[PDB]
Each structure stands twice: as structure tokens, then as C-alpha cells.
Amino acid sequence: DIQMTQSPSTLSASVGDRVTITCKASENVDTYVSWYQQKPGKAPKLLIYGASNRYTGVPSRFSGSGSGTDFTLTISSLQPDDFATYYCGQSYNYPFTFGQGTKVEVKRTVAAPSVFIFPPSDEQLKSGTASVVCLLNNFYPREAKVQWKVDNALQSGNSQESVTEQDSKDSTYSLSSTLTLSKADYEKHKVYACEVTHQGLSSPVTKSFNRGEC
Amino acid sequence: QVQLVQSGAELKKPGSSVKVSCKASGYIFTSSWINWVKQAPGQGLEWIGRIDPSDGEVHYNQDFKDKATLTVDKSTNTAYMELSSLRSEDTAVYYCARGFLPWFADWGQGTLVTVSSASTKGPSVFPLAPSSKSTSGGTAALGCLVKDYFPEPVTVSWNSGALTSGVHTFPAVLQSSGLYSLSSVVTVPSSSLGTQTYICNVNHKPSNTKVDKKVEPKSC
């Protein structure tokens, strides 16, 4: 019933920053709002209950305020252990509900990806399927776009991609994209191209190969 | 101190049912409610319901009224949640959480329930061979494509763990076939390509499939 709307969805910040995340309830919830921190593979952990009370063990850099429909969580000085997703939640009326989360990630200078393209192996082609792979290595920020082109035709709906978690050493992301075609379709075309768009690149980078070798 | 210990991951076919457990330690079990929460992959938290271990009084999120059944055995300090008529959309981590005051301090570690009609299958491992010429300098990329396996997970190492710097192993994608595909790559000095061997070590424990794939130049 009561919707919790968090903003921003993603927050980029540096160690030492003051960080503020906002949560808005669709109905009055008094001060029955809690904040939770979650890291990948782990259960949520309680930071703040009752809108403003610090749970036991929680460092003093965490605080919250608000009443009625508007709430904030503040981290006064961001520490390396604080990059995580944060959720607000109301416990004013059942069903208890939660915000969609705010991911706090590490800000750093923009970095363009190194791009690499990999043709399908001969071993795979024997099985009737071709996987062409495009790697975008060590870029920042996370937003990136891959466009597959086959003999200049933009491909859509026949690719899948995934992205690594932010790197703990250099704070970059990497992305792998796979275009999957039948062997019959693969052998009908010559030029396979991965075109990468990123805010670090002044213009798109394309890596390509021609089926057959060189 | 307080521990909530949940049962292990479940792999279930659609139409089936599953019963997940949550054993409580370190406090008086009948003095707090147990709440259940769903977190679908890549998504947020959804409250399912709660039960009072003292007497079994249960309340449900009405969205789960024909899906979830909460019970308790106070004699063994354990709460259970049964999900019926499983479908794809029931795939999630489910948490239990102790509830006294209007907040959730103590959470179980979560139980992953995956719902799929797929059957166990070990991966094919194909090379992502370092290119003949290209880049913007003296670093090359290579890798392995770990294709068509079920279920998760798969592990990948390089050179038996000797090679970690430059390694990126990506989240698997779920294909329309019901099977997963994953890539692992590494960037290395292009001058190393002729002299240093690179082997990806893949282990898919559910099918008992291990492969060592040596990857080297040979595209054109």
C-alpha cells in the first residue's frame, strides 16, 4: 500500500563526502521509518530505526531525520566501507514496504573503455552456434552502450551483456556483451563490428573483424 | 548473541512447492515475531508476512495469500515458509527477520530459491583468443567463454590462481534456452603472448564438470 520512493537511484561520491539519501512515503508514516545497508551477497543490516535512532554498533557518521512523508539518511563523512546499497522502509502499517534502493558508488575521473572483439571459435562453430564477444575494459562511469553491427546492419534482441561490480582498486567497471547467431547466419556475413559509446569517448569506438581471417 | 540460520539454496521445477526454514538462537524464540522478506534478483525488498511463534498467529501481505504459508515449531526454535505452485517470478532470495519493535535488527543469511524447468548441464568452454593486431598499445585481452550450463554457479581461475591481476569474471546471463553463459577475461602485456601460457580453470560443481582450457593466439 504505502509506497516508498528513494532518490537518487544512484549516487556517486568520494571518501570524505557528506551524503544524503531521500525517501518519500505516499501516505503519512509518522516516524516509523528505518534505513538498511546491503552489500552483495549479504543480508540487509539495520542502521537507523524510528526515523532518527542509530541502531547499536552503528557508527555516529550515520544519522536520519524526517517525519510525515519526507525522510533522509545522512552520512556525515563517507568511509571506504560505506559504498553499498541503502534502503528505507516503513513499519507504520502492514504490509511493511521498502524503497527501491540507492546505490552509493565511488566517484572517480571519467575513463574511456579499452574495447576488444573476439570472433567465435572453430570449436563452437562445429555445434551450430556462433558467439561473438565484445569486451569494454576498465571504464567509468558505469553507463555504456554496445551496438553490434553485422555488414552494417544494427543487431537488436540477439545480444546479452553483463557488468562487473566496481573495482576495489581503481573504481572502474567492465562490461562483456555476447551476440549469438546460428552458424548458418554467421557464415552468411563478413564484417562483425562492436561499436561502443561512452561519455569518456569523444566519438564511438568500433572494433571489428572479417570472418575468414584477414 | 542472536543468530537466524536459514536452510540452503533450492532448485525447483515450476508447479512444485518448497519449504524454507529459519532457526533462531540466542534469544527467547516466543518473545518476537518472525518476518519473511523476498528479494528478487537485481531488485528490492518485498514483505511477505509474519508469524508469532507463541501461538502461530500469522498475518500475510495479501499479494502472497495464495503463495506463501508461514508455520512455526516452537519446540525446535524454527520458523518455516512454504511457497506453492512455483513459477519463474518466485525466483529470489528469501530472508527471515526477527521483529520485536517496528524494525528488523536481526536477519537470517537468506535462502535462494531458483525456479526453472532446465536440467543440470556442464558448460562448453571456448577460447576468446587474443587478437592478431589492434588496441591502443601494448596490452592484449584474452579469455574464456563458459557457455550453456545449468544451474549457477561456475568458478573460473587463471593459471591455477597464479594470475589474478587484470582478471574480470563477469556475471552470467540467462539465455532463452534456460541455460547460463559467462565470460572471464584477462588483460596482459601483448609481448607476453608468445612466451607465457594462459589457462582458464573452470569448475561447474553441480554437473561435476572441470575444464582447463589453454588460450593462445589463432584467429587470423
Side-chain angles (χ1 to χ4, degrees), chain A, chain B residues 2-220:
Chain A
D1 220 329
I2 304 183
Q3 308 304 272
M4 307 295 278
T5 291
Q6 276 177 253
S7 46
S9 272
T10 306
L11 197 146
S12 308
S14 286
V15 171
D17 283 4
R18 178 190 195 72
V19 174
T20 293
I21 301 164
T22 294
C23 174
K24 179 144 190 96
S26 61
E27 311 174 7
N28 166 68
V29 290
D30 243 288
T31 61
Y32 294 97
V33 166
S34 302
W35 293 92
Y36 307 85
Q37 189 185 67
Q38 192 176 211
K39 293 188 184 176
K42 291 164 47 43
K45 166 185 177 166
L46 180 69
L47 306 171
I48 307 284
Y49 69 89
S52 74
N53 304 288
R54 206 149 35 236
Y55 182 61
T56 157
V58 174
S60 58
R61 58 177 183 280
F62 293 91
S63 59
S65 70
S67 63
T69 55
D70 303 299
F71 302 83
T72 55
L73 172 71
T74 293
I75 318 161
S76 62
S77 186
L78 197 59
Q79 296 301 303
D81 172 71
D82 296 339
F83 300 93
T85 293
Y86 294 86
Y87 291 100
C88 64
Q90 68 83 20
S91 53
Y92 175 75
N93 227 249
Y94 292 99
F96 290 5
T97 51
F98 300 79
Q100 288 285 270
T102 292
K103 188 165 176 313
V104 174
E105 58 110 52
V106 189
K107 169 61 194 163
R108 57 147 293 148
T109 55
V110 168
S114 296
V115 184
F116 309 86
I117 195 179
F118 299 97
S121 65
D122 285 358
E123 180 200 355
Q124 177 179 27
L125 287 175
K126 297 168 163 220
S127 65
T129 293
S131 296
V132 195
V133 173
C134 190
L135 167 68
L136 283 61
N137 199 67
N138 300 13
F139 62 84
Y140 185 84
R142 201 188 181 286
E143 198 192 348
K145 171 184 201 195
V146 172
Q147 286 194 311
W148 286 102
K149 306 177 171 181
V150 174
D151 285 331
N152 289 337
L154 185 267
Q155 300 301 294
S156 184
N158 53 358
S159 62
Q160 290 184 287
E161 70 181 25
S162 73
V163 182
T164 51
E165 294 298 274
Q166 193 168 34
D167 185 89
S168 60
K169 98 242 164 35
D170 67 30
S171 309
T172 63
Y173 295 95
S174 292
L175 178 157
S176 174
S177 177
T178 301
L179 176 69
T180 302
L181 292 204
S182 72
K183 166 198 199 34
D185 291 354
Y186 180 64
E187 287 181 0
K188 283 173 188 300
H189 311 291
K190 167 199 165 148
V191 182
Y192 291 81
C194 175
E195 179 172 327
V196 172
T197 292
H198 184 88
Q199 66 202 81
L201 298 165
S202 43
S203 59
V205 165
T206 301
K207 302 298 177 211
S208 61
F209 69 84
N210 310 313
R211 182 187 50 76
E213 270 156 353
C214 264
Chain B
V2 175
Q3 200 176 5
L4 295 187
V5 175
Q6 298 187 226
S7 45
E10 306 271 357
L11 187 54
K12 308 301 290 191
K13 290 169 66 245
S16 68
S17 74
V18 72
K19 192 166 183 170
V20 161
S21 67
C22 171
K23 173 208 52 115
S25 271
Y27 75 99
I28 298 173
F29 187 51
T30 51
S31 75
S32 292
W33 294 71
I34 300 299
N35 297 252
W36 291 89
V37 174
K38 174 186 185 170
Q39 180 161 45
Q43 324 207 209
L45 306 170
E46 194 177 5
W47 182 84
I48 292 172
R50 60 185 192 133
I51 188 171
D52 185 344
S54 326
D55 62 5
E57 176 186 343
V58 61
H59 302 318
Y60 293 99
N61 181 341
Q62 287 304 287
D63 284 349
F64 286 88
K65 71 168 166 188
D66 309 308
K67 175 55 60 173
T69 304
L70 301 194
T71 52
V72 169
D73 185 344
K74 48 180 162 173
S75 80
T76 63
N77 273 31
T78 144
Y80 299 92
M81 177 189 66
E82 181 163 19
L83 300 179
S84 67
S85 316
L86 290 172
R87 43 193 171 278
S88 174
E89 308 93 86
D90 299 315
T91 289
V93 177
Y94 289 88
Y95 298 96
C96 59
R98 169 194 180 208
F100 25 99
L101 300 170
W103 34 275
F104 292 145
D106 301 310
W107 290 67
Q109 86 283 8
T111 296
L112 205 206
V113 171
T114 303
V115 175
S116 174
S117 68
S119 59
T120 301
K121 190 195 165 276
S124 293
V125 182
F126 301 121
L128 299 173
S131 138
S132 302
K133 183 118 66 154
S134 34
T135 345
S136 280
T139 72
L142 57 108
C144 289
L145 179 57
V146 185
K147 202 183 164 261
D148 288 346
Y149 66 90
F150 184 85
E152 303 210 84
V154 100
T155 54
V156 189
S157 62
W158 287 88
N159 295 346
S160 297
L163 179 60
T164 53
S165 152
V167 176
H168 291 292
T169 288
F170 292 84
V173 286
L174 180 58
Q175 305 164 110
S176 76
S177 60
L179 302 175
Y180 295 89
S181 186
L182 165 155
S183 77
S184 187
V185 307
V186 60
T187 47
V188 299
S190 50
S191 69
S192 80
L193 288 183
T195 166
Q196 171 73 52
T197 155
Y198 296 107
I199 296 175
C200 67
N201 322 109
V202 179
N203 194 354
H204 184 239
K205 305 200 198 180
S207 66
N208 296 126
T209 302
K210 299 193 192 251
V211 22
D212 296 315
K213 176 77 194 172
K214 175 174 181 187
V215 182
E216 66 197 342
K218 174 49 204 346
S219 310
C220 79

